[PDB]
């Protein structure tokens, strides 16, 4: 069916090169990766304590 | 005078340590560090008690060169363990 | 209580005995931490804020740490007790008795010496320094400067260029 | 939620709160005026020595 | 006191070891090149250490050319580390 | 250009952090020579005394007065 | 002199009560519940770990070479606790003649703690991995000295008390923008287990987590400050703790969010890439007090 | 070893300049260490099991030696105070100073490393450097020749020609013969230092040129007496005439340049009323000649080293000054009578 995993050179000239260099010079995407866990911290966890609460089952 | 009497005695112990060898080769380079350590105390006190200001930089330069011999001579120690099994003063071929 | 530097000088020699004697590079290596750390106090007591801490940074936290690698790189032989070995205990006991016999002669002031110089007491005269300087004080208070000694900076930089180039060429 | 996390932070707002306050509040009992003098260099060290000489006997830092 | 402050930490550290000890009853030479370069760089750091505490009384124009000079050669030593360092 | 334009975008693409190692360190040598501000900083460094000033005996001297505030010598008052 | 005990006992509690923070804050990152059964919110668990490991847990040494193995935790805990002494705080205990030189010295000697542990085991199997752990700490200490000097050359001498006074209106994060990014990464090398990871074994936990708080505080002196206020010690004590706690969250952020960088490519991030960057900024920080008047 | 090998060789050249132009006692310590870090790589070069043993023996006997010098430098702070390389002042400091210099030049009790280090070099270019390195600590001795006690300097000169005059007799290794030829000539070096400072530096001018010509004649590979034997008949025959001429000048013989230093060494010593010491110098000088005499029998006699393998192609070595300097090494007797004054 074909889907292709390779990007085949995202940077070409001037504008497309600098932003691909900016993420490697400092971080940016690591700070963006930091934000993924940041919002994940605030949302309520699905946890069941066994001696009081019980997990889902079936007939 | 009084403080110098002990570190001069400490210098002679480190001097004999260089001249003494029993099987191991690593002790000599350890004694080279100790010899430069004993010289560092002797140099500092003479400039600190009898003020110089300009000459107080000289033991700092001496501190740098102490490590130069204790690295470039220390690098040769590893080369013995590449040719032979382990470092030994007993293991020598030259006549 | 009376002496400050004189007590530390005895511990300085005490750590140095395991160098004339041969207690293996493991226990012999441990001596430089004991003699070095106490050896800073001998330097620090008369002054020198920068120069006193340079022993901790280079001699203790650089020199012997590289020596920690080489003990594992060459001659490890699994660390052994330094008491069971022949002549090692004999060199250790004779090493301390050369200095500890002089310690007994410190009492009643004057002590016998191989050198021509006399020791006497020197407790208050041990420092032998007045106040003198106040603002930007001490000769070791401004210990190092790039000015005046311009030639020394070039050769030190040159010698440290040699070390990196040479050691890479040997291996 | 945060109501579980915050007691873990509040206990750190007590244990780490100690070294800051214990070093500061001790100057009331030890010194007269809640202050400890810094040595730095012999200029400030000599001023500490002459203050004890200027009718203080045992005290190092004392007013008048 | 500095001597009283240092010894209190070590004596309490030794006591924690005895608690666990007394109470209960029933190869590769490529690492070496990294270690050596640590020592040789730190000595250049040792020469470059005085900078914030030294530059107060001395002339700036005489120092500026000499202060940068040590850092330049510290980069030249790293430039020799680019011409085949190894697999490390 | 054969080296100016060609060896610029390739350096930004392959090993991009090496651009900063030459540009920042390079300008650190150029700036203290050309910019007219370095001369001011040298004057204040020499004007601030480390030790007590020495007194000279007065025998036909110009621009030297008493310790009180008067128009004598240099005395730095550069920028407030 | 009673204040020394008021800087060991609450500090040992801070390393103990980290066990709550190190898996509850880390827990909500991973959507799991941390401590809950033991205490009201798990406050009884940190002290319960001490009773488990110290008293009842026995020893089984590999060889026990006379002095070693029972000397390495003394060097581990001793050097970690002595680092608290030169700290400026609102007021420091026995202020040194030069501050940061004592800070870099006791951290460089803290390399021995992982060195003597490698010599404790008789086997060759452990020492190769032990020397690799030394390489993680020894290499980053080269740059740690450089980035320190660039902050110092901007303003102030080596004394830690002068570093608070220079930050009166604005933080040092803004003038040292790329240098502040370095201290987030370089501190994690000292056995934090976030970019790279390797009875008496329990004592190493009490020493390694102690250095984590130590690097959090030391970053909050070199880069943070906000206000001084000598007349009011109340305002400084509360404001300093919040700033240090926010950096403690970022230390546990890297541990959960990001995988290990490999040992070989740890020497490609540093040395190959970081050392040319740090020295170029060091070259820049030499020129700064000369270009514009900035001398303490 | 590409371009940077010249830079490594340049730091030895620059290292001696630091020793030459100096006023500070710690500056010469830097100057000695400039040589320490720069000779070892050329001592290794190809990396051999014999080269590893030689370089470690070269390091340990010389680094500890310079460390004794630093003690005498620090005694110059305890006593006399000033950091100047003019006088040694203290007799206590001179005892550790002269012995540190003896570890590099005196040789009489410190020769032990020389025959093993000189043999251990895999290349002919490394042989020149050890004969050139001896120039560096001679500059130190020329500065502090007064105050130092002559009783324990002249013993380092008398005993050195004795051990040098016996230590080459049981040696067939060509590098080893030249190693003991150093110690034999070093006795003449540590004899003019108490008696008139001039001509001591001219002794170096004669020696260094004579030794540099010697090893450059061994650019056609030879390591033993039997390997230098096959040179007259199989290899170039006219080349061995220059080897003969240089070896004859190495010993004390009048129509050659090598006798011209031996002139003033005795001449200045006899002026200081000493006759019993220069007599002992002349008799021990005969023992030096014997090594060169046996080595000239590889050039004069037949000795039968023909071999099956023969060379037809022309030899092209380095030869920096292997044509201009042997002419000065063969004949300079009439050329240099008043030249003693020109050097110093």
UniProtKB/Swiss-Prot annotation, chain A:
The name this protein goes by in its record: NADH dehydrogenase [ubiquinone] iron-sulfur protein 8, mitochondrial
Entry's Gene Ontology BP terms: mitochondrial electron transport, NADH to ubiquinone; mitochondrial respiratory chain complex I assembly
Superkingdom as given in the UniProt entry: Eukaryota
Main location: mitochondrion
UniProt GO cellular component terms: mitochondrial inner membrane; respiratory chain complex I
Keywords: 4Fe-4S, Electron transport, Iron, Iron-sulfur, Membrane, Metal-binding, Mitochondrion, Mitochondrion inner membrane, NAD, Oxidoreductase, Repeat, Respiratory chain, Transit peptide, Translocase, Transport, Ubiquinone
Family: Belongs to the complex I 23 kDa subunit family.
The protein's role, per its UniProt record: Core subunit of the mitochondrial membrane respiratory chain NADH dehydrogenase (Complex I) which catalyzes electron transfer from NADH through the respiratory chain, using ubiquinone as an electron acceptor. Essential for the catalytic activity and assembly of complex I.
Location within or outside the cell: Mitochondrion inner membrane
Subunit architecture: Core subunit of respiratory chain NADH dehydrogenase (Complex I) which is composed of 45 different subunits. This is a component of the iron-sulfur (IP) fragment of the enzyme. Interacts with RAB5IF.
A GO molecular function held by the record: metal ion binding
Keyword Mitochondrion included in the entry's annotation: yes
UniProtKB/Swiss-Prot annotation, chain C:
UniProt-listed InterPro entries: ComplexI_Subunit6, NADH_UbQ/plastoQ_OxRdtase_su6, Nuo/plastoQ_OxRdtase_6_NuoJ
Pfam families reported in the protein's UniProt record: Oxidored_q3
Primary residence: mitochondrion
One annotated GO molecular function: NADH dehydrogenase (ubiquinone) activity
Enzyme class: translocase
EC number(s) on file: 7.1.1.2
Keyword Electron transport appears in the UniProt entry: yes
Example GO biological process: mitochondrial electron transport, NADH to ubiquinone
Membrane-spanning segments: 1-20, 24-44, 46-66, 87-107, 148-168
Keyword list, A-Z: Electron transport, Membrane, Mitochondrion, Mitochondrion inner membrane, NAD, Respiratory chain, Translocase, Transmembrane, Transmembrane helix, Transport, Ubiquinone
Subunit structure: Core subunit of respiratory chain NADH dehydrogenase (Complex I) which is composed of 45 different subunits.
PANTHER family cross-referenced by the UniProt entry: NADH UBIQUINONE OXIDOREDUCTASE SUBUNIT ND6, NADH-UBIQUINONE OXIDOREDUCTASE CHAIN 6
Role, per record: Core subunit of the mitochondrial membrane respiratory chain NADH dehydrogenase (Complex I) which catalyzes electron transfer from NADH through the respiratory chain, using ubiquinone as an electron acceptor. Essential for the catalytic activity and assembly of complex I.
Family listed: Belongs to the complex I subunit 6 family.
Protein name, UniProt field: NADH-ubiquinone oxidoreductase chain 6
Source organism: Bos taurus (Bovine)
From Swiss-Prot, chain D:
Domain of life of the native organism: Eukaryota
Keyword Membrane: yes
Residues spanning the membrane: 1-21
One Gene Ontology term, aspect cellular component: respiratory chain complex I
UniProt keyword Transmembrane helix present: yes
Topology in membrane: Single-pass membrane protein
Subcellular location: Mitochondrion inner membrane
Keywords in alphabetical order: Electron transport, Membrane, Mitochondrion, Mitochondrion inner membrane, Respiratory chain, Transmembrane, Transmembrane helix, Transport
Primary location: mitochondrion
Description of how the protein assembles with itself and partners: Complex I is composed of 45 different subunits.
Functional note: Accessory subunit of the mitochondrial membrane respiratory chain NADH dehydrogenase (Complex I), that is believed not to be involved in catalysis. Complex I functions in the transfer of electrons from NADH to the respiratory chain. The immediate electron acceptor for the enzyme is believed to be ubiquinone.
Similarity comment: Belongs to the complex I NDUFA1 subunit family.
Protein name: NADH dehydrogenase [ubiquinone] 1 alpha subcomplex subunit 1
Organism: Bos taurus
Lineage: Eukaryota, Metazoa, Chordata, Craniata, Vertebrata
Swiss-Prot record, chain H:
Disulfide bonds: none
GO molecular function: NADH dehydrogenase (ubiquinone) activity
GO cellular component: mitochondrial inner membrane; respiratory chain complex I
Residues in coiled coil: none
GO biological process terms held by the UniProt record: mitochondrial electron transport, NADH to ubiquinone; mitochondrial respiratory chain complex I assembly
InterPro entries with a match to the protein in the record: Complex_I_Subunit_2, NADH_DH_su2_C, NADH_UbQ_OxRdtase_chain2, ND/Mrp_TM
Cellular location(s): Mitochondrion inner membrane
Enzyme Commission code: 7.1.1.2
Membrane topology value: Multi-pass membrane protein
Spans through the membrane: 2-22, 24-44, 66-86, 95-115, 121-141, 144-164, 177-197, 199-219, 238-258, 273-293, 324-344
Top-level taxon of origin: Eukaryota
UniProtKB keywords: Electron transport, Formylation, Membrane, Mitochondrion, Mitochondrion inner membrane, NAD, Respiratory chain, Translocase, Transmembrane, Transmembrane helix, Transport, Ubiquinone
Annotated catalysed reactions: a ubiquinone + NADH + 5 H(+)(in) = a ubiquinol + NAD(+) + 4 H(+)(out)
Major location category of this protein: mitochondrion
Pfam families assigned: NADH_dehy_S2_C (PF06444), Proton_antipo_M (PF00361)
Role summary: Core subunit of the mitochondrial membrane respiratory chain NADH dehydrogenase (Complex I) which catalyzes electron transfer from NADH through the respiratory chain, using ubiquinone as an electron acceptor. Essential for the catalytic activity and assembly of complex I.
Family according to the record: Belongs to the complex I subunit 2 family.
Subunit structure of this chain's protein: Core subunit of respiratory chain NADH dehydrogenase (Complex I) which is composed of 45 different subunits. Interacts with TMEM242.
Name of the featured protein: NADH-ubiquinone oxidoreductase chain 2
Organism expressing this protein natively: Bos taurus
